[PDB]
Amino acid sequence: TRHAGDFSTVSEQDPRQFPPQGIFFYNKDGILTQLTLRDAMGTICHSS
Amino acid sequence: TRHAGDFSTVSEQDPRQFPPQGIFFYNKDGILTQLTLRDAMGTICHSS
Lengths: 48, 48
Description:
The structure is cut from a larger assembly and holds two copies of chain A.
Chain A lengths: L23 E3 L5 E3 L6 H4 L4
Antiparallel strand pairs in A: 1-2
């Protein structure tokens, strides 16, 4: 982390250390959308 | 460290303090390439 104390929480285990599962980006109109790992279920949970 | 708390790692042992074994730089096109110690094998692991 670039500086000590950034994005701190009040838990006992900082949730940022756990591996990521989604990704955030902006829509056509500047709207925050998300895309997690279960969206790939229609691709990796197939007979192929 | 110019400022106490910079590049703070949550781990118990700061990996920044060990001796370095590589070096980073930029390509012709501005792409981050690396050059590690094991690349000197063809030179220092010779018969000469």
